[PDB]
Amino acid sequence: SGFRKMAFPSGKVEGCMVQVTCGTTTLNGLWLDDVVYCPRHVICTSEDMLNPNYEDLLIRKSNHNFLVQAGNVQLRVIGHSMQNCVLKLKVDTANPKTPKYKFVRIQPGQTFSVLACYNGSPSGVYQCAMRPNFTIKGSFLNGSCGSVGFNIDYDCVSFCYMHHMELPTGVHAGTDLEGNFYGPFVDRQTAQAAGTDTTITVNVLAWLYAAVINGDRWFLNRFTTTLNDFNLVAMKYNYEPLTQDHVDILGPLSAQTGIAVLDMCASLKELLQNGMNGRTILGSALLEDEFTPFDVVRQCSGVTFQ
Amino acid sequence: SGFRKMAFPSGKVEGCMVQVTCGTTTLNGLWLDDVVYCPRHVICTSEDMLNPNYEDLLIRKSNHNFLVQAGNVQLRVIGHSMQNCVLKLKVDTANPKTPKYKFVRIQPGQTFSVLACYNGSPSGVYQCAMRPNFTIKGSFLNGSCGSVGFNIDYDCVSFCYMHHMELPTGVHAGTDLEGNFYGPFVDRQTAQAAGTDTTITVNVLAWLYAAVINGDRWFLNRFTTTLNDFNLVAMKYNYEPLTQDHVDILGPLSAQTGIAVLDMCASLKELLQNGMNGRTILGSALLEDEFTPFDVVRQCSGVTFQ
Numbered sequence A, B: 001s002g003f004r005k006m007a008f009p010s011g012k013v014e015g016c017m018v019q020v021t022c023g024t025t026t027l028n029g030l031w032l033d034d035v036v037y038c039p040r041h042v043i044c045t046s047e048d049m050l051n052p053n054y055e056d057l058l059i060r061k062s063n064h065n066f067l068v069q070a071g072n073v074q075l076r077v078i079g080h081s082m083q084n085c086v087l088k089l090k091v092d093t094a095n096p097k098t099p100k101y102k103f104v105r106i107q108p109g110q111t112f113s114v115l116a117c118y119n120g121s122p123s124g125v126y127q128c129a130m131r132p133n134f135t136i137k138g139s140f141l142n143g144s145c146g147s148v149g150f151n152i153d154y155d156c157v158s159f160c161y162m163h164h165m166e167l168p169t170g171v172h173a174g175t176d177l178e179g180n181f182y183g184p185f186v187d188r189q190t191a192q193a194a195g196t197d198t199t200i201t202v203n204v205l206a207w208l209y210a211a212v213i214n215g216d217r218w219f220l221n222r223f224t225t226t227l228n229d230f231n232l233v234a235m236k237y238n239y240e241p242l243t244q245d246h247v248d249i250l251g252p253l254s255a256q257t258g259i260a261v262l263d264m265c266a267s268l269k270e271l272l273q274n275g276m277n278g279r280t281i282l283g284s285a286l287l288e289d290e291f292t293p294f295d296v297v298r299q300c301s302g303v304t305f306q
């Protein structure tokens, strides 16, 4: 038993991380088959980050202007092109450690692991959620750009995020691997702000189920609610509306625990209206919303990879 | 910026995990050079675990009683021995993926990453601290024994923990990689309980420094405390004593932020006595104690590994 904010094992991704340098800027790239993907702002110059003309900056580059290294091994760039906010650097060697992979664009409320890297070297791994406002709350310093977010299933790595920027509230923005930003953000240092950060209701409910599985039952009560009456309370606390689809995907946890979805909703309603009265749930004094229902089932059932 | 509970990248350790089966008991082993290390209770049956005599149980064992699998491949066991509470299974193949490594003994308050595994395969990675009562709060199911905890440093993997057991609060206990338990526990199913948990004061202070570094300053106050008077408060809230050696260890964070260590102690005293008054620190409503001073410096400075 026990329930922790767990990341995917990172070894498949660590074998794809490379260092890309242009001019004096070094950031990270992702090496899959014979292409390295990296944020296009590696070509920016520091006096021209307000509105860079990426088109102009890129067509003036030659392949040798991009220095790519995997570990201490130089990779030779033999082509370069732009796709949205990422560059695709064609290299002369297919990465022999390429896992089975796909590029996925995730939905708000979904979770993934971030392999935070600097100078092409992994430094740490953690679990994040795509917030409803299409930012993430990560841990990223200068030089972390090009670090990726990913899920695994069986032996297939679904890459879903590449890191590009930090917004003033200390929150992070980036693209999918097609190079399109999540949310309305752009890769230039013009003033930009995140929208409303709402709480992911279906994930809070999943985590309440995880709590019951792991022996925390004090919030369970004798009440129920309709979905309508729950959502009326939820909106007042800046929680996203629960839908029938959400109720459906909570089905398996409800069955395993014997607690009906709308009874758990009644427990959550009471927690929202009354707080925890000095108690904790799975070591937290806040209602935790960065576990999906599938994350709970994976961890509580010991699902493994390859 | 940002601050997250970050684990070490797990790939170097993933390459070492194998499955070990004896009879119908299956758990994980650590394959380093030509040795597989695993908990000795793998030789216990369904009824042996109440109060096993491991010398007696090994009378009944030969090499082919240990089925070791690395991925799909059967390793052949050519010797076995008992060392403290682990078995060393000598196999006829050296692990080609053996990293540079060492075995270390950690002390309470120190942190490490756990790669939770089942059947020799990785389920996920998370960061833990060795509690003052020599347990960890992990996420472990039946079959997780033999999963290891580790730190990474420069190029070297420092293994510090191997998982053996769960105590009834959902607390976890295990050994170092020499097979000696952390804490006063034994590998048998006789009633045992850890000492009451206390809070790792030096780590809470480190995490308050992380908060200041990342822009959270609302808890800084104009008050002063002495080490003695602060410890009077710590004892009342079941915090570990803060020593002058701890004060020295916090020196670099104090210098970086301009906040004297005992001034941060005055901030923590007020938090303990009055709570957070509806505010949060680094996204938490409780005082976090599983980041060491070194963890804070390393995350706020972007230290990487290969």
Ligand SMILES: *[C@H](O)[C@H](CC(C)C)NC(=O)[C@H](CC(C)C)NC(=O)[C@H](CC(C)C)NC(=O)OCc1ccccc1
Binding pocket: A027, A041, A044, A049, A140, A141, A142, A143, A144, A145, A146, A164, A165, A166, A167, A168, A186, A187, A188, A189, A190, A191, A192, A193, B001
């Ligand atoms: C890439 O390694 C680095 C990582 C960050 C976590 C710092 N990203 C950048 O440097 C990025 C490059 C630009 C060209 C996309 N810049 C930012 O992320 C920038 C950081 C601040 C501190 C300047 N954020 C930004 O420009 O947000 C837009 C903005 C501008 C002005 C006011 C508010 C918001």
Ligand SMILES: *[C@H](O)[C@H](CC(C)C)NC(=O)[C@H](CC(C)C)NC(=O)[C@H](CC(C)C)NC(=O)OCc1ccccc1
Binding pocket: A001, B027, B041, B044, B049, B140, B141, B142, B143, B144, B145, B146, B164, B165, B166, B167, B168, B186, B187, B188, B189, B190, B191, B192, B193
């Ligand atoms: C190893 O895979 C498995 C992992 C746990 C997470 C289940 N560990 C064991 O099965 C281990 C083997 C024994 C011989 C060391 N047993 C325990 O950890 C046991 C599990 C409970 C659920 C029975 N815990 C235990 O025996 O704690 C001591 C104890 C006994 C009786 C009352 C209180 C405490």
